[PDB]
Nucleic acid binder design. Structure first.
Lengths: 298, 213, 123, 222, 199, 236, 266, 244, 60
RNA sequence: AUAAAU
């Protein structure tokens, strides 16, 4: 299945980008506002960017660690696409170019980066370990899937609580949420993912050698803008003033200076997003109990 | 596994006079079928062969037929999948001489052989080689029952791990399988398997006559 | 159904002196022999202009005679003569009741009173 | 029977909905009629691609059964002969179980049926009639028939039931019983008392459903 | 080398120059000697002749359009070989593969320095190779079919006819400028000159 | 008076009613019954003996019908016709080359893949590939159907498009004319083509129609155009 | 692999099936085509080889070792076969894999005594095969490479005592020092049956028209199992007289030492 | 049991190299003429890579055919004996490998016009015989060489490099030990330009470091590019001498 | 860089930017008239019009 | 008879 786009659309949107205009009425460095909604259960988070809707669910179960890593727990991230986000996606297509890329971006941003403290997922060394699972559900698509997913996974992990455990060797009674409160998963850092789309002016005249048409670069492109881009760039940054990961495969060849500018622009966005994410975690944490102060011991 | 139900992955499996019975045409799902049961001493083998074809292949320009054979483990998981493929390759090297391929252009014949059971008794203070002549017997029956033209009746025998398949009344050879055993058994195995062939042949011919009648 | 032709699939073949030979195959795979009836091979009357929509219908059974093998994809089928045409059919692509053949170019249903335009044969 | 639903929430799909009963929340999407894969093609009728996604983990054989039962309900509902050689993708993403998924799949199935129907309505696909599904359960001591049981009620149940009926004539005439999935063991008197009280609350639900449909859709029309 | 495109002379700016005497032809020759490029076309008739005869030749410079009576000047036209085989003067044809043959046959004329806009159009990958298409989109001119099926033989030639004879070359040099420039840009110019030499 | 599927019909069985979108005639039981949800519209002509009806319902998946104006995109070219898809993930439609003004077997049209065309559906069968034609006889001597150039195309639900094409009381075309000059093609397949002299105006029109498509408000739409054309100024 | 017309195949059969058999090339029924062999180019491995045929057929073998408990690890020599651009699962792959593992069994055609370290531990040998390119049955090609590789393999040397039953010392190996793997790798020859003639090293075109084929193993200066008849193609497979089978075994029995002699050069 | 460091105060690394040394580079063209249209054997350090370019040729399935451009496919075979410790399982389906394959495709899709071979297919088969750090950079160099050998048109060279970072200063061309010790950056450089085809960072990297690390890599990649030109030209001179 | 003369017509094996003409392949620089091209050392065989070729049917 | 069977 190949989507059909009119030649008229391809000429219109491209010309509009040369006039610094876009369909959804945004800027080039602007990122669509992200809305984060938490469900009743911990680990249930819904991320919304304009029309883009993604849902993440964090779950865990008692499991045994690998032989190679007796002190580390298990952690996996699932991002299987479905025709619900659009008929362009094949059901279970986990080997397609865009799918594998997205899967690899998230993995290198959360798993590989060590955003989650897997060492704190161990109950008894080389015997029993917690197995945290992050399931991302792509409900609908209006672009920015990678950005939506990173926010969804991280917000979920920071939301998530795991039943309190008392361990005495090989026997462990997992206290229920009724008996005692659940324990929040450890976090080392908060990675945020930014997606950049590159374009070509296709214009006859440039006013100056000194100042030139250069390259088109926008942030968080919509579905219509994502099909017309000539280049893809994803940079992951945090509030710790460091680059988590950056993935550029082919596309429109760009200077090292341009990448840095995108990287510096993304840093201002990930700062606002991280603080906002923490805020909505703070508002939901205080939200849960109508009578919590009456509840307290210490 | 999201395809089947494998259960808990943290668990572990359990750790601890020649006689023939031939029946064909008992499966209505395919074009030809066969049941072969053999009991010798403490060792017995029961396998089922299913034949589907000849069915037309769209766009096929082959001037002859195409045979595909696959062995399966019905119950006991003993034989390796790698070894099953090897026998399958051996079996196809046999029936490509037996089956009149010129009769089925642009067509293909799929052959499924289910090794539902084999029972082995070993005393304490190869293996699949013994099943091979029974697989050949089953397929040759299932093909003849299906209506597939065979140039000759294919049969074989197992002598000290040396399997050799015969046609044209033992005058020629359509397959040879030798594993381990002992040397200088060339002349002996050729004579012992030739007797097993002739024995398996007459019972195979009689089988068709019986059921066909 | 297409505009310039009509492709089908072969089910059974008439024998020679009625008796038939049923070809057993899976219809949900595509292993069944496929055939194509040209618009010029629909009827001898007015071979040039023939409306395929008013002749055949998806699901309708058609008795025809094969002019030639053609390619591996499509056989050549003609319903030019009188004893050839749509034999068994139902109203509304099979949603309605059974219909019977009266006129050569008209098929009626003596149950709901529905009449659909087909290419009918002669008993 | 205080359910809540929204229609047309997804942008890149022909039709969508979000059905919520108690905890159980299911979002559904429908695209069709569209071009089908060769292996999906049906010469005369419409081909249904039905997908069910669980709230936790990946789709297993459990959801494969949910897809199968949901197929038995949606198939006779759709006027399939209107779309020969064509495809209709139907995807259900269960967002919240509302029940112990390790033991039951009752409420998730009923919510998927109601959501799928609503998504088909939104998509504008030919339907022969209307449909509604409710989960029912029976208590261990009291043996009472509880319509729309909670998760806690299911734990202490002797039998669990999924009932989906086909309605015509302004939601007053039961055309047929599309699906009845009873797991457990039964007594005849309880069954018909269940069906009598069940029909009443179902009829009340349709009336409520009609109200919701008109209220949301009328501002769009002229 | 890419250069600014020189538009065609404005319509009605100049009358086509009719060439049917030896003298007019010689003047025309002196004129073509002064160009760096010229556009050429022919009209050919095959109904009342076994092999065919060349009935008209159209030649345009950047400034003027010429219409040559190749019937009256059949035995005179060979002197154009001075310009037609001068390699430093581009000769622009559209659809000239037959016309090359006929120049030879009838007039004894050859072309060294050919650029064929048909190969140019193909190399660039335009949707249609038709000559009128260029006139339709670049000259805002609507092409007319009917006269061609007739006999160009009859004279005096109709004023409406003159535009059609006039139309063919009046516009071609600009089209050459535009096609040339894009071919240079596209890394495909070398290919078109090769095809043109084969024609 | 909202109408739902399976709803009872007041009209008598002996007297026929002309088919309308939303209304379905069962091939088996011959009964006429509504299958869509919305407002029933019925037109009666003369003192007695004739009737017509349909249902205005919210649907966005187009189904080709005779005499419907549609805007399609020609993905590919066959031997004798163009393959044009009115909508995404929808069956292809057959457009004849000979379905153009001044057509000939010698000269094919110059339309290339990716071009927008304004077309009307001539023959549309449920079990057969649909067909469209560039020129429609019913409209007049000249169809006004020609491939669109440039501009911008807009996705819109079938109801919004039908109201924009047949309803003169729809203020959308008026409120857009009060802001800028523009030409518009309207397709019953839920496509709207808009083109101005400047891109900023076309973009402004796009954004208004989208919001109007979203908003569905008569009062909002007049204001909506106000804030949209205003926002482009500052953005400039 | 190779695609030939009906005319070409018949001509080939006439050329080769003739009583004075002639190779299309001109070879004799016992002459092999020239091959090139490289060894010891993978320092990361214990042993390695690379064989290049005349038709471009190329195979790479690697030898790696691992200390295992021979009381729980029955098979001490595991052969793994692979081909880039080819799925692992394929009938040809598993068959050759199964076949090769039988050729190099621990107690069949290999002196597994040289792999033993202590009472309780021994060296597990992993023979990884990579077939880059091949135009016929690569079984004999792989066999030559495995041979060359196993004859240039060097394993670590043990330091600790060799009695785990009593003292039970942890297996430690002296640094730097290594011991060459003294072993007798078997060879696998493949023959072609065209009419009544038997050809050693069948070419691609030759195999296409062959009536049948033979796979005969060779170890310790004598014929050994596995011995397998094999259909080189599937369109011209016919039964063969027993004397042909005895002819093939005899043919290998006299030409194999010549091959080994040209192959035994260090 | 042992322990080791990264960078000593003496400016020496674990293997003996200093902070700015490229490993031994050997390059080889036309290694498999009878197996592919283009072929290259790469030796960058202990890394050993066979690269085969098969095409442009007819697609095996008409379903997968583009009438506007050639289909470019890349399959990387990381052998089970590439490392010191033999891997039990195959690495072919591994998500890490699928990303690598995808990454490489994205890189060269913009580097070959791929508009002049319509209705054809270019298959690139790679076999990694030995691995010792910077395998991604070596993969890039192997494809670029093999593609050129096949006479397949491309706009420019694409050189791949590996970067190692300790404290203030990164280490050029990292091996497995260093890769284990510290985060690395893999750079795809087009020709002699400053434009990156591939920027790959999989581990944590201070934000201050990258600008300077990039500067070191680009300079080193230019040297690598110069060597490659020398490697092919030198071979041509050698081949001509052999002919003479 | 092969040349910096903008008068040249760039042929196969080359590409250009303003005055500069670069090589796209590894081979020898060829100058025929005004047509600058670079002949590759290796590559696929190319069909010229009028060649006598021998071929084996692939598909019907 | 001004460019025919993607």
């Amino acid at each position: 299945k190949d989507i059909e786009i009119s030649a008229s659309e391809s000429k219109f949107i491209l010309e509009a980008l040369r006039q610094n205009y876009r369909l959804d009425g945004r800027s080039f460095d602007q990122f669509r506002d992200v809305e984060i909604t938490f469900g009743k259960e911990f680990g249930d988070v819904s991320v919304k960017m304009g029309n883009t809707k993604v849902h993440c669910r964090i779950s865990c179960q008692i499991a045994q660690p690998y032989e190679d890593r007796p002190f580390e727990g298990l952690f996996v991230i699932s991002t299987e696409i479905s025709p619900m986000a659009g008929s362009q996606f094949e059901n279970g297509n986990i080997t397609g170019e865009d799918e594998v890329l997205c899967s690899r971006i998230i993995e290198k941003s959360v798993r590989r980066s060590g955003a989650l403290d897997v060492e704190g997922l161990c109950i008894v060394a080389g015997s029993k370990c917690w197995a945290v699972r992050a399931d991302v559900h792509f409900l609908d698509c209006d672009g920015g899937f990678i950005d939506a997913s990173c926010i969804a996974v991280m917000a979920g992990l920071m939301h998530f609580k795991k039943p309190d455990i008392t361990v005495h060797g090989e026997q462990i009674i997992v206290h229920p949420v009724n008996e005692r409160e659940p324990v929040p998963l450890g976090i080392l850092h908060i990675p945020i993912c930014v997606t950049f789309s590159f374009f070509n002016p296709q214009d006859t005249e440039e006013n100056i050698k000194g100042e030139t048409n250069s390259e088109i670069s926008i942030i968080d492109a919509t579905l219509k803008e994502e099909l017309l881009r000539d280049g893809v760039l994803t940079v992951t940054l945090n509030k710790n003033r460091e680059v988590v990961q950056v993935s550029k495969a082919g596309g429109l060849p760009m200077d090292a200076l341009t990448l840095m500018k995108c990287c510096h622009e993304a840093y201002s966005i990930i700062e606002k997003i991280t603080d906002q994410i923490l805020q909505l975690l703070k508002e939901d944490s205080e939200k849960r109990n109508k009578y919590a102060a009456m509840l307290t011991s210490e | 596994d999201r395809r089947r139900l494998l259960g808990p992955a943290a668990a572990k499996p359990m750790a601890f006079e020649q006689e023939l019975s031939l029946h064909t045409g008992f499966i209505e799902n395919c074009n030809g079928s066969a049941l072969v049961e053999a009991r010798s001493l403490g060792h017995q083998t029961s396998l089922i062969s299913a034949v589907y074809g000849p069915r037309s292949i769209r766009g096929s320009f082959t001037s002859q037929g195409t045979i595909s054979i696959q062995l399966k483990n019905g119950l006991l998981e003993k034989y390796n999948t790698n070894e099953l493929k090897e026998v399958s390759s051996f079996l196809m090297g046999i029936f490509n001489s037996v089956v009149n391929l010129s009769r089925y252009p642009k067509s293909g014949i799929d052959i499924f052989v289910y090794l539902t059971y084999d029972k082995d008794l070993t005393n304490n203070p190869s293996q699949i080689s013994s099943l091979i002549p029974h697989c050949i017997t089953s397929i040759t029956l299932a093909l003849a029952d299906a209506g597939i033209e065979l140039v000759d009746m294919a049969g074989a025998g197992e002598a000290n791990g040396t399997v050799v398949s015969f046609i044209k009344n033992g005058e020629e050879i359509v397959g040879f399988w030798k594993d381990d055993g002992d040397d200088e058994d060339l002349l002996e195995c050729l004579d012992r398997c030739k007797e097993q062939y002739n024995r398996y042949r007459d019972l195979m011919i009689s089988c068709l006559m019986n059921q066909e009648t | 159904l297409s505009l310039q032709r009509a492709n089908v699939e072969i089910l059974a073949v008439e024998d020679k002196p009625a008796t038939f030979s049923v070809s057993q195959a899976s219809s949900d795979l595509g292993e069944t022999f496929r055939g194509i009836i040209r618009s010029q091979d629909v009827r001898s009357t007015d071979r040039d202009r023939v409306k395929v929509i008013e002749c055949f219908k998806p699901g309708d059974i058609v008795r025809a005679q094969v002019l030639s093998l053609g390619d591996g994809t499509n056989y050549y089928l003609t319903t030019a003569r009188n004893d050839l045409g749509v034999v068994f059919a139902r109203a509304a692509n099979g949603a309605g009741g059974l219909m019977y053949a009266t006129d050569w170019q008209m098929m009626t249903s003596p149950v709901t009173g529905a009449t659909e335009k087909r290419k009918c044969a002669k008993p | 029977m205080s359910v809540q639903a929204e229609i047309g929430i997804l942008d890149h799909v022909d039709g969508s909905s979000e059905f919520v009963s108690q905890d159980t929340k299911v979002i559904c999407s429908v695209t069709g009629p569209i071009e089908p894969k060769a292996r999906q093609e049906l010469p005369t009728q419409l081909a249904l691609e039905i997908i069910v996604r669980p709230a936790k983990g990946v789709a297993t054989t459990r959801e494969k059964v949910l897809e199968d039962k949901l197929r038995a309900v949606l198939t006779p509902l759709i006027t399939r002969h209107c779309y020969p050689r064509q495809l209709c993708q139907i995807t259900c993403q269960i967002l919240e179980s509302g029940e112990d998924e390790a033991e039951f799949s009752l409420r998730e199935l009923s919510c998927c049926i109601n959501a799928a129907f609503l998504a088909l309505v939104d998509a504008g696909i030919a339907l022969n009639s209307m449909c509604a599904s409710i989960p029912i359960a029976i208590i261990k001591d009291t043996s009472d028939i509880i319509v729309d049981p909670t998760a806690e009620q299911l734990k202490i149940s002797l039998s669990v039931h999924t009932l989906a009926l086909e309605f015509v004539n302004g939601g007053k005439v039961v055309k047929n019983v599309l699906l009845l999935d009873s797991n457990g063991d039964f007594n005849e008197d309880q069954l018909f008392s269940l069906l009598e009280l069940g029909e009443q609350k179902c009829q009340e639900l349709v009336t409520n459903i009609r109200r919701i449909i008109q209220d949301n859709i009328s501002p769009r029309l002229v | 080398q890419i250069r600014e495109e020189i538009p065609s002379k404005s319509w009605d700016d100049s009358v086509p120059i009719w060439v049917d005497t030896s003298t007019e032809l010689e003047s025309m020759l002196e004129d073509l000697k002064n160009t760096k490029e010229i556009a050429v076309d022919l009209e050919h008739h095959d109904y009342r002749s076994y092999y065919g005869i060349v009935c008209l030749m159209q030649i345009s410079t950047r400034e003027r359009d010429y219409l040559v009576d190749t019937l009256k000047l059949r035995e005179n036209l060979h002197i154009l070989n001075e310009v037609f085989t001068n390699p430093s003067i581009v000769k622009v044809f559209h659809g000239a593969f037959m016309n090359i043959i006929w120049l030879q046959r009838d007039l004894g004329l050859y072309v060294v320095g050919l650029f064929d806009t048909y190969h140019a159009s193909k190399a660039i990958g335009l949707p249609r190779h038709s000559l009128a298409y260029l006139l339709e989109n670049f000259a805002n001119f609507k092409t007319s079919k009917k006269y061609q099926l007739a006999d160009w033989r009859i004279r005096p030639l109709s004023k409406p006819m003159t535009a059609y004879a006039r139309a063919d070359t009046h516009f071609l040099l600009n089209i050459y400028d535009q096609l040339r420039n894009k071919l240079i840009e596209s890394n495909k110019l070398a290919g078109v000159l090769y095809e043109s030499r084969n024609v | 008076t909202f109408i739902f599927p399976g709803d009872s019909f007041p009209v008598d069985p002996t007297t026929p009613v002309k088919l309308g979108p939303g209304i379905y005639c069962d091939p088996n039981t011959q009964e006429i019954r509504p299958v869509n949800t919305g407002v029933l519209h019925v037109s009666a002509k003369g003192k007695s003996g004739v009737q017509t009806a349909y249902i205005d319902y919210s649907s966005k998946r187009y189904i080709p019908s005779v005499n419907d104006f549609v805007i399609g995109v020609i993905i590919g070219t066959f031997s004798d016709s163009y393959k044009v898809s009115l909508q995404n993930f929808s069956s292809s439609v057959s457009l004849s080359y000979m379905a153009f003004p001044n057509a000939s077997k010698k000269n094919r049209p110059t339309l290339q893949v990716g071009d927008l065309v304004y077309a009307r559906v001539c023959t549309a069968e449920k079990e057969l590939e649909a067909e469209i034609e560039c020129f429609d006889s019913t409209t007049g001597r000249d169809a006004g159907f020609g491939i669109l150039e440039d501009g911008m195309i807009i996705d819109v639900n079938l109801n919004f498009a039908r109201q924009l094409l047949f309803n003169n009381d729809f203020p959308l075309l008026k409120v857009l004319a009060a802001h800028t000059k523009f030409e518009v093609a309207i397709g019953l397949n839920g496509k709207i083509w808009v083109k101005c002299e400047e891109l900023s105006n076309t973009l402004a029109c796009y954004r208004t129609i989208m919001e109007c498509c979203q908003k569905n408000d008569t009062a909002a739409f007049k204001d909506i155009a106000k804030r949209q054309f205003k926002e482009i100024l500052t953005v400039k | 692999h190779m695609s030939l017309s009906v005319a070409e195949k018949s001509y080939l059969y006439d050329s080769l099936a003739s009583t004075p058999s002639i190779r299309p090339d001109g070879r004799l029924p016992h002459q092999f085509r020239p091959i090139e062999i490289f060894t010891d180019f993978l320092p990361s491995s214990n042993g390695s080889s690379r064989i290049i045929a005349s038709d471009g057929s190329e195979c790479i073998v690697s030898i790696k070792s691992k200390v295992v408990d021979h009381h729980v690890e029955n098979e001490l020599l595991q052969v793994d076969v692979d081909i880039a651009g080819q799925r692992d699962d394929a009938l040809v792959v598993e068959t050759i894999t199964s076949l090769l593992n039988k050729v190099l069994k621990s107690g069949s055609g290999v002196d597994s005594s040289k792999l033993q370290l202590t009472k309780k531990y021994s060296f597990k040998i992993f023979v990884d095969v990579l077939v880059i390119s091949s135009h016929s049955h690569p079984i004999s090609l792989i066999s030559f490479a495995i041979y060359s590789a196993l004859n240039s393999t060097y394993l670590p040397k043990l330091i600790s005592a060799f009695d785990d039953l009593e003292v039970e010392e942890l297996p430690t190996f002296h640094d730097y020092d290594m011991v060459k793997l003294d072993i007798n790798p078997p060879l696998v020859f493949i023959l072609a049956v065209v009419g009544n003639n038997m050809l050693l090293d069948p070419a691609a075109n030759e195999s296409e028209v062959a009536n049948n084929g033979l796979i005969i193993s060779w170890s310790n200066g004598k014929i050994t199992s596995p011995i397998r008849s094999v259909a080189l193609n599937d369109s011209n497979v016919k039964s063969f007289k027993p004397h042909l089978l005895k002819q093939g075994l005899a043919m290998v029995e006299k030409y194999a030492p010549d091959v080994v002699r040209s192959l035994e050069n260090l | 049991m042992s322990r080791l460091e990264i960078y000593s105060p003496e400016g020496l690394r674990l293997d003996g190299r200093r902070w700015n040394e490229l490993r031994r580079f050997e390059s080889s063209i036309n290694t498999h003429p009878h197996a592919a249209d283009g072929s290259s054997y790469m030796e960058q350090g202990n890394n050993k890579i066979i690269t085969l370019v098969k095409g442009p040729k007819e697609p095996r399935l008409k379903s997968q055919m583009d009438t506007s451009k050639a289909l470019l496919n890349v399959s990387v075979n990381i052998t089970k004996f590439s490392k010191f410790e033999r891997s039990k399982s195959s690495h072919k389906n591994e998500r890490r490998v699928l990303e690598i394959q995808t990454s490489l495709v994205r890189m060269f899709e913009k580097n070959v016009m791929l508009n002049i071979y319509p209705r054809t297919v270019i298959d690139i088969e790679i076999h990694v015989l030995e691995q010792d750090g910077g395998i991604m950079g070596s993969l890039i160099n192997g494809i670029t060489l093999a593609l050129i050998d096949a006479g397949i048109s491309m706009f420019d060279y694409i050189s791949g490099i590996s970067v190692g970072l300790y404290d203030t200063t990164p280490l050029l061309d990292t091996n497995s030990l260093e890769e284990n010790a510290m985060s690395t950056v893999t750079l795809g450089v087009v020709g002699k330009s400053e434009k990156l085809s591939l920027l790959l960072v999989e581990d944590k990297i201070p934000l201050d470091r990258l600008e300077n690390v990039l500067a070191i890599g680009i300079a080193g990649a230019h040297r690598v590019r110069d060597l490659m030109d020398e490697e092919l030209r030198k071979h041509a001179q050698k081949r001509v001498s052999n002919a003479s | 860089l092969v040349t910096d003369d903008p008068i040249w017509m760039r042929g196969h094996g080359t590409y250009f930017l303003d005055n500069m003409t670069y090589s796209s392949v590894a081979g020898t620089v060829s100058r025929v008239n005004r047509l600058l091209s670079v002949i590759p050392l290796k590559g696929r065989y190319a069909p010229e019009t009028g060649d006598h070729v021998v071929g084996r049917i692939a598909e019907v």
